[PDB]
Every structure is written in C-alpha cells, then in structure tokens.
Amino acid sequence: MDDQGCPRCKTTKYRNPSLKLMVNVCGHTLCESCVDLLFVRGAGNCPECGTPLRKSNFRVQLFEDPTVDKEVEIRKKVLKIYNKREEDFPSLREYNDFLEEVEEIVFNLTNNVDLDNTKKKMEIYQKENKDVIQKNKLKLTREQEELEE
Amino acid sequence: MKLNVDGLLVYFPYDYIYPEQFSYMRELKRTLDAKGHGVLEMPSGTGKTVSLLALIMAYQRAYPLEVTKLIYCSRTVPEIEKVIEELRKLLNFYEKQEGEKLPFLGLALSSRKNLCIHPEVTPLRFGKDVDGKCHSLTASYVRAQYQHDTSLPHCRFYEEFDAHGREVPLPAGIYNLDDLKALGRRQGWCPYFLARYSILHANVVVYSYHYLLDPKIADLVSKELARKAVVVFDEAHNIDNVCIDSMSVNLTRRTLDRCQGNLETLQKTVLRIKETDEQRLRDEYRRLVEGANPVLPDEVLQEAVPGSIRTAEHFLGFLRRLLEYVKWRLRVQHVVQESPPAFLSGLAQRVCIQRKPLRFCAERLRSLLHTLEITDLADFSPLTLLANFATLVSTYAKGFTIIIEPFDDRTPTIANPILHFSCMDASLAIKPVFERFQSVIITSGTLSPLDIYPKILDFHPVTMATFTMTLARVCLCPMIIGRGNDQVAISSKFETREDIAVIRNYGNLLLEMSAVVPDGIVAFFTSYQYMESTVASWYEQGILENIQRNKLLFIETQDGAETSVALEKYQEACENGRGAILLSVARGKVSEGIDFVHHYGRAVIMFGVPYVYTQSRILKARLEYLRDQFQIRENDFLTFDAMRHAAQCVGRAIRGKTDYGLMVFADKRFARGDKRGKLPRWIQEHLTDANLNLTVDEGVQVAKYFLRQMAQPF
Amino acid sequence: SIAMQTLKHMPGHTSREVLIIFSSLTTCDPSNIYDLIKTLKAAKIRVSVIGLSAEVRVCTVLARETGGTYHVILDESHYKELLTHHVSPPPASSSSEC
Ligand code: SF4
Ligand SMILES: [Zn+2]
Ligand SMILES: [Zn+2]
C-alpha cells in the first residue's frame, strides 16, 4: 500500500489502499482496478510486457517486491518436493545439503530455464512420490494441527 | 587502619569507619565465605566502594585460589572513573604499608570511542563510527594487506601491539581511562587492546554492564577464564531495565527502509566481487560447510551448521524474504499485537522461512559480510540489527514477546510505526552471570526491598541485609508533605493531575521552600508532559514569577544538548549566591547520570510519585508476565517500580563526606505504609510519624530549623 | 566592593576586617563574586560572615578562603554570643603583618 501507484493507473492507490497486488507469471505489479483493464482486452496479457496468461494468472498477494512474489510462489511449489524431515538422514552434512540444492533450484527456476529443473524434478518424482512425499504430505496436517493448538 | 575482621585482618586507608561499615564488611565476608551469590544495600554513594574494594583485596590475599579476580561494574564511564581513584588510593596505602610492589593489577575497560589514539577516529564521536572505522583499520584484509606494505593507511598501533604486547604483558599498576590513553601513545600500542589482553592476567577489572550483560560483546571478554571470580555490580538497582535493554530490539519503518537500501548495496557489492575476486573469496564457502556479534548466550548459541543459507546469493534472498515479511507485518494498521511463538510460526508459514535456518542468520551475516571487505559496518548497521532480531526471534520466545505498534504514542497519525521485541523477564539474560561466576554481589544504593529481586532474577541469595547509615550527626532529615495550606489531598493521581488546586499547592510549596532552602535545589516531576503542564499553570499565575525573583529557575528538556548546557549553568548558580531550581523528570537520563553533592541539590524535591504511563503496551507484557511467572502482583511491581525509581532520584544528596541535606517528597502517597515500607531502610528509619505528613507551612518551618542545626560545625 | 574601596587605602599595619550580616540567602551581583575573592586575599581584608537562617555556600568559601569564620544563627540568644565574640581582636595570621 506504500507504493506510489500502478505503472499505468496511479490514482486508486492514492485514494485508498484497499487494492492488493495480484501475482502473475510475469512477476509483475498489477492492481484490481487495472485487472479489469486487462480482462476487457487480451484477457490474461500483461499490458506492457504482453506475457500470455492461461486464465488471468491472478492471485492476491501483499508483497510490494515483485521478485519476492515469484520467489515465494516458486518456493511454495518446491516445498511439495524434498519435504522429507531432517532426521531421515543420520549424516550431519546431508541434513542441510539437500536444502542447498532446493534453494539452488528455486533460484534456478526464478531466472534461468526450468527445463533442466523440470527434467530433474521428474527423476525425483519417480522415487520420492512412492514413500516420502506421501508420508510427509499426510504428516503435514498432523503436525500443523498439533502446532496450532 | 588495619581492621581485625572476624574472617581475617583487613587494611583500610581512611582513619575511621562507621558502625554500618563493620556490618557491611562482615556480611560481605559471609557471602564470600559461603561462595554464594547474594545482594546487599549500602546507603552512602561513596565509602562503600573503598570498604567493598578493601575487603575483596584482603580476601584475595588470604584465599587467592578462592577468588581469581574481581569484576566491579559501574553504571557510567564518568562514574566508573571515580572508582579507579578509590582503588588507586587504596593500593598506594597498601603499598606504603607493605613498602614494596606486589603482583597486583587493576585496569578499567571502555569503548574504543572513549579512548583511542588514532587521529582519524578522534574527530568522530559516534560509537558506531569508531567501531566501523576501527574494524576497517584492524580488518584481517588490512592486516594481510599490511604485510604487503602497500601504500594505504594502516593503523600501526594495533600492529605494534601484536608484535610487542603479545610477547610481554604489563607487570602491574593501576591505569585510569585518561591515564591509560597516555600509555598507549608512549608505547605505540592500543589503550583498548592492551587492556583487553590484560584481562587474562588482571586482579581487578571494571567496566559497565553492557560490557558484561549483552551476549554480543560481554561473552568475548567475560569468557570462562573467570570461572570463580567475584563479580560485583554497584548501584545496580536498575539492572533489570538495563538487562532487558540488552535483549529488546526495536525495528522501525525508517530503519527497515535503510535495511533494504543497504541490502541493495550488498547485492551490488557481491556482483563486483564475483567479477574481480571470486575463487579466493569463494573459499569462505568451504569452511562454512565444515562449520556486531551473536546475541545468543553461551549455552543458547549454536554452531552446528549455517543451514540452507550456504552462499551469498542464497543468504541475500533469505534476508529479502524475512525483510519483506517484517515490512508487510509492520505496515498492517491495527491494534497492538503480541505473538511471541506465533510470529515465528506465521513467518515460517507465510514466507516459508524455517526457524533453524533463521537461527544462524545473524551468525552467517557476520561471516558473509566479512568476505565482502566492506568499507565499514556503520553503513550496514541497520541490517545487522534486523539480523540480530532475525536470529533472536528464532532462538527462543518462551520468555519474550513481539509487540507491533502501527501507531506511535503522542501522535494521532504518524507514518513511522515501530515494532518492539521487548523482553519480559531479566533472569534469562543474566542467567550466565550467576551460573558462570561462583558468586555475584549486587551492591546497590537506594535499593527497594531486596525480597523482590530474587523473584525478578532467578537466584538463591545467601544474605539479605539492609545497612543503615549511622553518623554522630543527622545528615539527612527527609520529610513527606501531603496536606497543603488548604488541608487538601495533594496526591498526583492521573485523575487528580488536572486539578488546579493541587498544582497551586506544589507551586506554593516550592516558592516557600526556595525562599528558605539555601543555594542548590532540584525538583523532579513524573513526566515531561506533566512537568510542562505544571510549569505552564504556574506561569499563568504569579507563583512562577515570584520563584524567579527568589532564585534562578532551570528546566530540563528531552534534547541532550540543552540539558548539558542548562545543567552546566546550574552548577555555576549553586557556586554563586543566586541559586537555581532545576526542574527535571525522574526517568530523565539526567537524573540517573547526575550526582548531587555538598552545596549541590541541597534539598531534593519530589513532585508526585514517579509512575510510568499506564498505556505503554511494552510494560504490559513485562508487567502481566511477572504476575503469571514469579507471582508478583501488578500493583506490587508497579509500586515497586516507583519507590525504586523515586529512591534513585532522591538518594543523591547524601553522596558522601557527611554533607547535610533534606529530602522532601511532595505527595501524600509516600505517607502510605506500603510506600514507606518499600522505601530504603536507611531513609525510612530516619523518617518519623511526627514529620510524616507535615503541612506545606509546617514542612517549611521544620526545614528551616533543621538547616540551622547542620549549619553549625560538628 | 564599597568596603574594599575605602579599605584599600587604609594603612597596612591595621587589620582590615568585614562582618557581613547576611539575611537573604540570595546574592544578585553585577559581576561574579569569585573574582572579587581573589582581590580580597591580596588586599588581606578579613571577611567573616554571620549568616541568618541559611548556610549559604558562596559565603562559606568567602570566610574560609579569605580567613574569616562562617556561622549561622541558632536563635536570638545565640545571636548575642556570636557578635560579642567578634568584638575581641582576631589573632594575626601569617599573612598579617605588624
Ligand atoms: S586499532 Fe587501536 S589505535 Fe587503531 S583505531 Fe582501533 S583502537 Fe584506535
Ligand atoms: Zn493499474
Ligand atoms: Zn509485465
């Protein structure tokens, strides 16, 4: 809400801050009053960049930094992979070592081509999906429920 | 004057000692004999130090193995300076009695800003600047570059010390901070580092609490070397507040904005480094895999591995993520929110920042920031504060709390919100001191009743004694005035603050008191706003003008520069016959820093019981928590917060040399039994029911009569 | 100052003295009085204040630095005692010359 305004229509923010940033594959600031401007023509196209969007690629976000939006959103998907708990590995190095590649993948996905990452992620899928992904995914609700109370 | 103490024979420089000193020394020896931490109170500002210092020295000679060394801490560097004079006098007396030098060393530490010999850092006075500048000069890269002897300003004093100071330690002697500066210049060494090394072999070391409490810098010099040492805190009744300040970290939007701007430079610097020097500086990663100072104490601090942040780019993004969360978390406009454990959970859930990688964030910053060969840490200081806040939150929140204030006080609408991380209990940060050291003696003056302190600070005291000053003459004649000339209650209650009549009584009492009281008088209020309102109300009426005629009037302000000038003029007025009336606030840094002696602050006037505003949410987490844990009533601590604060600002007039003075408290609340009991014993025992609630007119007459008695010689 | 001007020209042999009966503790003066003390010591003018209902600080140094004595009135009866004491000639000190 502290931003001066939209790159195109910088008038609604001054009047009220109720408008919230909308995340997109462009990692690219947009505003609700300006979202309607995109639906009328293009229907999922960035005004200046013109990046195509499948169905509006819109989700509410409140992080003024566009890079954080992509970094945070990408990290959300990556967390679905490599979610195995630390204690699963007795080796001291292996605890945080795999997290390093996870961070590398996130940064690799942000800017560089994800084709290598997608191909790599497929290799992990064939192995992790069987036991670890299913086990940790189910246990996420159990730990979260206990943690909340 | 050799004293045949029960435990042993103890020397003493001055000719005579009052009975309280005998009680003081014997009680102190009992704690030392029991080798257990304890607390005791002594009235006199001066005289206790020599008795305290002398007894420790004698005990050291009798049982040198029992006590390795003495760590005597004082509030302020100006104050700690007065202590070394007492120690220096004692050693000469002992040296003359022995007739020869003995292997005894005593030195005082201070910040590099206070004492230093490099001309470049001399003109600058900011503490951070010297630390940033000194780090650059002493930076390993400069040291490594100094070996190359390339054309670049290199600070020789550290270099010369390394070649010389390391080989030979100073034999013995006592060196003041001002004196210690001279030695560094002559020998071409650091007055700071030379003292730092001497801590390994030094009988007495003295420095303020922030050299011994904050884990960032206290731990390094307070290492396990002093496994069994007599650590002593003097006049440390405000130890919890200072102990808490060592942990509380304040995050502000302007500070946060500076962090982002600083972070932008960090990324730019990394890019330049990669193209210029990468392989050599990439070596930091290799050691990182193997595995500004950390705020985590000895046991709490962890060094297993840095975590998922193993590279500069990875770490920098981590700060960006955490900084964004704080930026957004702060921008929210809402009522004050408290979330000690939930913030960490919310931080982890919202932005995917696990606590364990966040634990080492600050520790990784110091190592990573070092590789960048930055010009100085002063520019990036705001980022470190967040980093210290970044690691601290992830470290522990059992006895802590994050307080978010979208709106600041005294402002209906302000665009500079501040996020507080105020602690709630002081036992957490001071635990290592009690645990590490065999025994700690919290010697204090004007101490409110000792029973609360063990509750606030988790320790098992050995002795709990209150020492009452005893003199052939009644040096102090305190009184409390609750009834005015109108026989009207004069309590300075919040609802009674606006009453004009109560304000009128205070002005009239000061006018009459200023008429009879000789030159030198200080009046303490409860808050700046309340002081201004009373000052303005008096200004409208003719009371204020008359006081100006009778005696000069001086007032205190928040700005330090005005305070120093006003006080500087105030001292001159006391010397001359004009006199002066210094209005001030009990919480004012002037009240704690300043010390009043003979013909200075002759009659200390207290206008209203000193209570903090009941709206500051920070005190609530501190206050309500103490009710839940350690089982202290909110009113009990709240009143204890006033008597200790009131006693602090009224016990100055009895500094030393038996200089007369009367302490008048213009509030009927002090007449209540609860306030009187929590008052220090030495003041309270002098107080009597006859003068407990003297009227304004009645109080003045006794004040005039009492001064007459003290005017005549012994 | 008024006393100093008239006593400045007095003969050296005679012992100049001043007895200030100070009543109001305040002292509003055009110039700092500490400087005037330096002149008095050189002029060897003894100033022995007798304060009233107040132990004024500035006169405390005035009496002891200049050689005089400082006192405060305990009561009316004590007041007679003090002045009568000053009637007797004061002992001549080292600074005093005959
Ligand atoms: S190395 Fe020593 S002399 Fe040089 S700036 Fe630091 S403290 Fe001062
Ligand atoms: Zn727009
Ligand atoms: Zn775009």
Q: Which residues contact B313 (CB under 8 A, 6 or more apart)?
A: A107, B270
SS3 A67: helix
Q: How far apart are CA B325 and CA B390, in angstroms?
A: 11
The token pair at C19 is 């007895």
Give the C-alpha separation, B422 to B403, whole Å.
7
Q: Is B192 in the pocket of ligand 1 (CB under 6 A)?
A: yes
Strand, coil or helix: what is A129? coil
Do the annotations mark residue B43 as ligand-binding? yes
Helices then strands, each counted (H, E), chain C: 4, 4
In angstroms, the CA B477 to CA B485 distance is 22
| Residues in contact with A70: Cβ distance below 8 Å, sequence separation at least 6, in sequence order | A23, A27, A110
Distance between the two ends of chain C, CA-based, in angstroms? Answer: 25
CA of A30 to the centre of ligand 3 (A): 9
Task: Please classify residue B20 by burial: count the beta carbons closer than 10 Å to its beta carbon, then call 0-12 exposed, 13-18 middle and 19+ buried.
Answer: buried
Q: Do B320 and A71 touch (CB under 8 A)?
A: yes
Partners of B583 in beta bridges: B523, B555
3-state secondary structure B436-501: HCCEEEEEECCCCCCCHHHHHCCCCCCCEEECCCCCCCCCECCEEEEECCCCCECCCCCCCCCCHH
Atom 2 (ligand 1) nearest CA: B190
Compute the residue count for chain B: 714
DSSP class of residue A28 equals -
Hey, what are B8's tokens?
Answer: 């042993």
User: With contacts defined as CB-CB under 8 Å, which chain A residues touch B264?
Assistant: none
Rounded to whole angstroms, how far apart are CA atoms B33 and B14? 25
Chains A–B, number of C-beta pairs less than 8 Å apart:
51
CA distance C26 to chain B (A): 5
Q: What is the DSSP letter of B72?
A: E
B439-444 vs B38-41, strand pairing mode: parallel
Q: Measured from the CB, is residue B137 less than 6 Å from ligand 1?
A: yes
Q: Whose CA is nearest to atom 6 of ligand 1?
A: B134
Instruction: With CA atoms as reference, report the closest residue to B463 among B67, B40, B55, B72.
Output: B40
Any idea which fold B476-711 has? Rossmann fold (3.40.50)
| Whole-number Å distance between alpha carbons of B386 and A29 | 27
Nearest to A107 among B307, B313, B357 (CB): B313
Which among B449, B451, B491 has a CA at the least distance from the CA of B611? Answer: B491
d(CA C26, CA C97): 34
Residue type, B502: V
Nearest CA among B261, A5, B322 for reference residue B330 = B322
Separation of alpha carbons B506 and B486, rounded Å: 12
Task: Give backbone dihedrals phi and psi of B481, rounded to 5 degrees, phi first.
Answer: -115, 115
Q: Which of residues 689-708 of B touch C (CB under 8 A)?
A: 704, 707-708
- A62 Cα to chain B: minimum distance (Å): 7
Q: How far is the CA of A21 from the centre of ligand 2 (A)?
A: 10
Q: Which amino acid is at B682?
A: W
List subunits contacting chain C, requiring 3 or more Cβ pairs under 8 Å. B
Question: What is the Å distance from ligand 2's center to A3 Cα?
Answer: 12
In 3D space, the residue among B604, B607, B692, B691 whose CA is nearest the CA of residue B655 turns out to be B604
On chain C, the residues whose CB falls within 8 A of the CB of B519 are 25, 56-58
Rounded to whole angstroms, the Cα distance separating B396 from B393 reads 6
Q: Which residues lie closer than 8 Å to B611 by C-beta, 6 or more apart?
A: B526, B638, B641, B642
Q: Looking at ligand 1, which residue's alpha carbon is closest to its atom 1?
A: B158
Q: Tell me the nearest-neighbour CA distance from B393 into chain A, angstroms.
A: 17
CB atoms within 10 A of CB B204: 23
Which residues precede chain breaks (C–N over 2.5 Å) in chain C? none
In sequence order, which residues have a C-beta less than 8 Å from that of residue C31 and are 6 or more positions away?
A: none
Number of H helices, E strands in chain A: 6, 2
Cα(first)–Cα(last) distance of chain A, in Å? 32
3-state class (DSSP) for residue C34: helix
Rounded to whole angstroms, the Cα distance separating C36 from C30 reads 11
d(CA B148, CA B146): 5
Chain A residues within an 8 Å CB radius of B288: none
Q: How far apart are the first and last CA of chain B?
A: 23
* Measured distance CA(B519)–CA(B576) in Å, rounded: 8
Among candidate residues A14, A52, A16, A13, the one with its CA nearest the CA of residue A30: A13
What are the distances in angstroms from CA B698 to CA B147, B487, B512, B701, C74?
A: 78, 11, 11, 5, 19
The two tokens of residue B306 are 């840095």
- Interface check B316 vs A, CB under 8 A: no
How far is residue C88's CA from residue B393's CA, in Å, rounded to a whole number?
A: 80
SS (H, E, C) B534-600: HHHHHHHCCHHHHHHHHCEEEECCCCHHHHHHHHHHHHHHHHCCCCEEEEEECCCHHHHHCCCCCCC
Alpha helices in chain C (DSSP H): 2-8, 33-43, 57-66, 76-87
> Cα separation of B113 and B127, whole Å?
6
Q: What is the DSSP letter of B237?
A: G
Cβ–Cβ < 8 Å for B438, B31 = no
Tell me the Cα Rg of chain B: 28
**DSSP H stretches of helix in B139-252:** 140-148, 156-164, 177-187, 191-198, 215-221, 239-245
Asked if C58 and B550 come within 8 Å (Cβ–Cβ), the reply is: no
d(CA B488, CA B218): 52
Rounded to the nearest angstrom, the distance between the alpha carbon of B312 and the centre of ligand 1 is: 30
Helices and strands per DSSP (H, E), number in chain B: 29, 21
